[PDB]
Inverse folding.
């Protein structure tokens, strides 16, 4: 038994918000770095319930493109979650405003993103809030899906549960969430991934939200890809977006088919 190995020093605030804050912790002995999410179980139906679900889901996660879950510590009202420290930071910061990033980097990040999503969907888990700020990068620039505070189970005992809860982030949310009472979970995550792809290649989001009243969204459905925000995206990745950002979730391309898309399998480019 090595003394002090259980002592972690909080040396930097990684993130802060409703949930509370995320601090970088370094092991007193080994100097190992991890991310510690601090969530004060206040209110009632709030944290006490929400944080418990987030924990159960994290305990199911084990994939190279998903933030690792080390464990959790509860000290009365305060709840501590020991998660993977990704020194690379948020993919969000790798996105140059109005520019994006080199197509090959985006393709690489997109490959890793799909890998993570396939994994989650494979074990019946939907994230429900995929966006650049939740996509982390490690020291080698490997994409990691993070924050399962909005995640939930959509498949259990081989039976799919349709969803109806409106959650996520408007710019990334699928249109069916704003138009239908119930919807299939998977196409919703594929959609947000497409908006993330769009952001990586153009450095701007296509619309405030996917609805009629939204100008750019209507233009997209009218295929006005000329000059408009899609003007900055090469034709190959654009052909993929045309298949992902499809109004009808039933007609939307699935991940197995995205894996077959030409740009997706295009070397480097
Ligand atoms: C304070 C300044 C310097 C650091 C910057 N942040 C970069 C950064 C670097 C490494 C990070 C995170 C952010 C966020 C995070 C997480 C993380 C894991 C899991 C969750 C979650 O489960 O919700 C949230 C955040 N692990 N590693 C990191 C912000 C301004």
């Amino acid at each position: 038994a090595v003394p002090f190995v259980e002592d972690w020093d909080l040396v930097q605030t990684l993130g802060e918000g409703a949930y509370g804050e995320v601090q970088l912790a370094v092991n007193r002995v080994t100097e190992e770095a991890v991310a510690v999410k601090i969530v004060d179980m206040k209110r009632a139906v709030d944290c006490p319930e929400n944080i418990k679900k987030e924990i159960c889901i994290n305990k199911m996660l084990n994939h190279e493109n998903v933030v690792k879950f080390y464990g959790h510590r509860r000290e009365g009202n305060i709840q501590y979650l020991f998660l993977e420290y990704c020194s690379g930071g948020e993919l969000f910061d790798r996105i140059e405003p109005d520019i994006g990033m080199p197509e090959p980097d985006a393709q690489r990040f997109f490959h890793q993103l799909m890998a993570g999503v396939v994994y989650l969907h494979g074990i019946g888990i939907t994230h429900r809030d995929i966006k650049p700020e939740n996509l982390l990068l490690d020291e080698r620039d490997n994409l990691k899906i993070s924050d399962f505070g909005l995640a939930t189970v959509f498949r259990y005992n081989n039976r799919e549960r349709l969803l109806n809860k409106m959650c996520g982030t408007l710019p990334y949310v699928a249109p069916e969430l704003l138009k239908r009472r119930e919807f299939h979970a998977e196409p919703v995550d594929v959609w947000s991934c497409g908006i993330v792809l769009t952001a990586m290649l153009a450095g701007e989001l296509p619309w405030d939200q996917p609805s009629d009243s939204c100008q750019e969204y209507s233009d997209w459905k009218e295929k006005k890809t000329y000059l408009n925000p899609w003007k900055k995206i090469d034709s190959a990745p654009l052909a993929l977006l045309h298949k992902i950002l499809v109004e009808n979730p039933s007609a939307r391309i699935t991940i197995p088919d995205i894996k077959k898309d030409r740009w997706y399998n295009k070397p480097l480019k």
Observations:
- Helices lie at 47-58, 103-122, 176-179, 185-202, 215-221, 235-244, 255-258.
- Residues 13-15, 22, 35, 37, 67, 83-87, 89-90, 136, 146-147 surround A58 (CB under 6 Å).
